[PDB]
């Protein structure tokens, strides 16, 4: 019935779909305030009451839908700037086991905004693309150290992103399950 | 430029924003300093002198400045046009040395005494409410809801005064606390001031506030 | 010095279509990962399907009557329908795999839950008739030839158990939410660690060991150990 590759996990398309439901801040280039939108899964007042160059908050999928056309501009999140990413890299280097406290959707949102909204950043984009890479590489080192503690009981993780978890899910759970089977078989 | 409600405004070579108030009444018309850009960048930088940063103003929307933040040699923007920013006005009340002493990750914006924050809010609320009131008195509402903003400003005004009042009561300065109590508007706030006086264990001030509340209740009955 | 933050708080203070979709997302994500078949949300689905019908008619009326609002409405209805489609397909796939187990659970007169509590009416129809189709196929083809001791299809007593059931000890990823209302002082299970966040405590019985599940930290945990907290929405599956 359901496809074989969706029995236990989410595909990256579903991960993008999940991230798209979050709110984001925009500057509209038109006034809607005095037809009306009449949505059923969100607030409707914000879109009906827009005024040009007045900041407002909407779901990300509608924000990208507007930015497709002239009608809108997207404000970048404050963590997505050179100063903050510098500090997070320094945190990563300083604490050789803890993960730095980046938001749960950082990879997905960065790789959406760099494609759909390359024109709306303040920093030069060719530097952000480097610092995002540095963060992902350091985190991958820390992941490879952690896979030596798979065990029969449990594990704790902190600040690991959704896409990063979903990348690893079928390996961690499978090896952990087999260690559990081997151990309990000796008890019985 | 003119404000979003027709007030005359100008930005000085000192990088300060000035607005002309009470222009409808020549014996009351006066110039007001409502925002210093340099003080904002100083706090934003963690109390540092990032003179490489410059502010280019665009227009005034109610309480918020539209502006470009320019970096580098030349203190004005270039092409293609960078995106604008938004920034709120605040009253000039602070001191660098005092705030450094109060403050005493490396660029973290400096922490401020609650007294300064409440004082600045009460002044800002007062000025904003007066300007909005003058606008409504002469030109009315454009949109049908601005009175609600004025009500919110009055609430913020009493709220700020209550914090300052409570500080005076905690200091046991009954004279200053009583003088502050005259400036509160709603009897809700005066009732809260009575509770605050009870916590301060000032029955004399509870008495005199209730005298004021009774006097103002009589004035409300008249 | 005198505190007034509570005085200011008491001075100052003087179901929706948005919420249903969040509940749907929650149900979808939990159903995908968990090893058992979770109970159907009977009320939520009724309200959602009615809303879908009304929105469809509204879109038709406005179309027959700027382009962009219609664009938003149309694609929103697509986004809503996709989630429900995926969710129902997953549940039917679970019913295929545990058909004999669900039938045995229903036949047990002493069961603490009835099959109609767990499944929707459409799911009941599918389960019942699909079992008969599969039964007819193997009964005629294979079992017609076997001796009478081996003709049963759901035999428990043979040298291998013919009934499959969920792996209650499957490992799953979890994220600790706490009580939904923010009522940390009211939750009776929510104790506190030293100089930090509140936490829950669970006992893993094969090993006779305990762990502390702090609010906000992520874990890889056995399913049965965390089943009760999941049912109470203290945690959510990642």
Swiss-Prot record, chain A:
User: Where is it found, in Gene Ontology cellular component terms?
Assistant: CMG complex; DNA replication preinitiation complex; GINS complex; nuclear replication fork; nucleus
Alphabetically sorted, this entry's keywords are: DNA replication, Nucleus
Highest taxon listed in the record's lineage = Eukaryota
Key word Nucleus present? yes
Pfam families per record: PSF2_N (PF25005), Sld5 (PF05916)
Q: Share what the entry says about its subunit structure, partners included.
A: Component of the GINS complex which is a heterotetramer of SLD5, PSF1, PSF2 and PSF3. Interacts with PSF1 and SLD5.
- Protein family per UniProt: Belongs to the GINS2/PSF2 family.
What protein name does the entry list?
DNA replication complex GINS protein PSF2
**Which organism's genome codes for this protein?**
Saccharomyces cerevisiae (strain ATCC 204508 / S288c)
From Swiss-Prot, chain B:
Report the locations given in the UniProt record.
Nucleus
Annotated S-S bridges = none
Q: Where is the signal peptide?
A: none
WD repeats sit at: 12-52
**Briefly, what is this protein's role?**
Accessory factor for DNA replication. It plays a role in accurately duplicating the genome in vivo.
Any remaining note in the record?
Present with 3280 molecules/cell in log phase SD medium.
| Protein's UniProt name | DNA polymerase alpha-binding protein
Q: Which organism is it from?
A: Saccharomyces cerevisiae (strain ATCC 204508 / S288c)
Q: What is the lineage of its organism?
A: Eukaryota, Fungi, Dikarya, Ascomycota, Saccharomycotina
The gene from which this protein is expressed is: CTF4
Q: Which residues of the full protein are shown?
A: 688 to 927 of 927
From Swiss-Prot, chain C:
Query: By what name is this protein known?
Result: DNA replication complex GINS protein SLD5
Cellular component GO terms, alphabetical: CMG complex; DNA replication preinitiation complex; GINS complex; nuclear replication fork; nucleus
User: What keyword terms does UniProt attach to this protein?
Assistant: DNA replication, Nucleus
**What InterPro entries does UniProt report for this protein, alphabetically?**
GINS_A, GINS_bundle-like_dom_sf, GINS_Sld5, SLD5_C, Sld5_GINS_A
Gene field = SLD5
Q: Where in the cell is it found?
A: Nucleus
State what this protein does: Required for DNA replication. Functions as part of the GINS complex which plays an essential role in the initiation of DNA replication by binding to DNA replication origins and facilitating the assembly of the DNA replication machinery.
Assembly with partners or alone: Component of the GINS complex which is a heterotetramer composed of SLD5, PSF1, PSF2 and PSF3. Interacts with PSF2.
What's the chief localization of this chain?
nucleus
Q: Which family does it belong to?
A: Belongs to the GINS4/SLD5 family.
Q: Might you name a Gene Ontology BP term for this protein?
A: DNA-templated DNA replication
Which lineage? Eukaryota, Fungi, Dikarya, Ascomycota, Saccharomycotina
Mutation effect (residue 28 to R): In sld5-12; temperature-sensitive mutant. Defective in DNA replication
């Amino acid at each position: 019935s359901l496809p074989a590759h969706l029995q236990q996990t989410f595909s990256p398309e579903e991960i993008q779909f999940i991230v798209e439901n979050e709110p984001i801040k925009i500057f509209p280039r038109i006034t809607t305030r005095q037809t009306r939108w009449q949505l059923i899964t969100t607030d409707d007042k914000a879109l009906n009451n827009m005024v040009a160059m007045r900041s407002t908050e909407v779901v990300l999928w509608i924000a990208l839908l507007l930015k497709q056309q002239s009608k809108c501009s997207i404000v970048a999140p404050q963590w997505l700037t050179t100063k903050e990413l510098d500090r997070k890299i320094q945190y990563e280097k300083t604490h050789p086991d803890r993960f730095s406290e980046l938001p749960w959707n950082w990879l997905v949102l960065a790789r959406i905004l760099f494609n759909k909204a390359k024109d709306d950043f303040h920093d030069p984009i060719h530097e952000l693309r480097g610092k995002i890479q540095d963060l992902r590489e350091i985190r991958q080192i820390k992941v490879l150290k952690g896979l030596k503690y798979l065990n029969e009981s449990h594990l704790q993780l902190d600040n690991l992103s959704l896409l990063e978890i979903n990348e690893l899910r079928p390996f961690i759970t499978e090896i952990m399950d087999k260690l559990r089977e081997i151990h309990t078989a000796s008890l019985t | 430029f003119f404000s979003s409600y027709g007030d005359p405004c100008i930005f000085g070579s000192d990088n300060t924003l000035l607005l002309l108030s009470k222009w409808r009444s020549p014996e009351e018309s006066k110039w007001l300093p409502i925002l210093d850009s340099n003080m904002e960048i100083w706090k934003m930088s963690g109390g540092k002198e990032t003179t490489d940063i410059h502010v280019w103003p665009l227009a005034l929307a109610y309480d918020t400045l539209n502006c470009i933040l320019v970096k580098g040699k030349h203190i004005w923007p270039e092409f293609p046009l960078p995106l604008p920013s938004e920034m709120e006005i605040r009253m000039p009340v602070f001191v660098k040395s005092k705030l450094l002493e109060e403050n005493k990750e490396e660029d973290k914006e400096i922490q401020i005494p609650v007294s300064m924050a409440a004082e600045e809010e009460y002044l800002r609320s007062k000025v904003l409410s007066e300007l909005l009131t003058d606008t409504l008195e002469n030109d009315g509402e454009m949109y049908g809801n601005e009175n609600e903003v004025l009500a919110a400003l009055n609430g913020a005004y009493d709220k700020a005064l209550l914090r300052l009042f409570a500080s005076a009561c905690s200091d046991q300065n009954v004279e200053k606390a009583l003088s502050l109590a005259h400036e509160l508007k709603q009897d809700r706030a005066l009732t809260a001031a009575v509770k605050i006086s009870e916590r301060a264990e000032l029955p004399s001030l509870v008495k005199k506030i209730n005298n004021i509340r009774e006097a103002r209740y009589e004035q409300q009955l008249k | 010095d005198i505190n007034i933050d509570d005085i200011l708080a008491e001075l100052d203070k003087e179901v929706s279509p948005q919420q249903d979709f969040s509940d749907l997302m929650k149900s979808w994500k939990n159903e995908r990962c968990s090893p058992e078949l979770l109970p159907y949300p009977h009320q939520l689905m009724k309200r959602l399907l009615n809303r879908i019908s009304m929105q469809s008619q509204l879109i038709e009326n406005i179309s027959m009557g700027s382009k962009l609002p219609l664009l938003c409405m149309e694609t929103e209805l697509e986004r809503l329908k996709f989630v429900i489609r995926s969710y129902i397909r997953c549940r039917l796939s679970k019913i295929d795999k545990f058909s004999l187990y669900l039938r045995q659970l229903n036949e047990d007169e002493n069961s603490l839950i009835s099959l109609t509590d767990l499944l929707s009416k459409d799911e009941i129809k599918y389960h019942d008739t699909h079992s008969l189709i599969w039964l007819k196929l193997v009964n005629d083809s294979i079992l017609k030839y076997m001796p009478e001791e081996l003709q049963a299809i759901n035999d428990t007593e043979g040298s291998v158990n013919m009934i499959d059931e969920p792996d209650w000890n499957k490992f799953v990823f979890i994220h600790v939410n706490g009580p939904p209302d923010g009522k940390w002082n009211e939750d009776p299970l929510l104790q506190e660690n030293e100089f930090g966040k509140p936490c829950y405590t669970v006992t893993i019985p094969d090993l006779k060991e305990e762990v502390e599940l702090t609010i906000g930290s992520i874990y890889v945990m056995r399913y049965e150990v965390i089943r009760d907290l999941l049912r109470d929405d203290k945690v959510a599956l990642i």
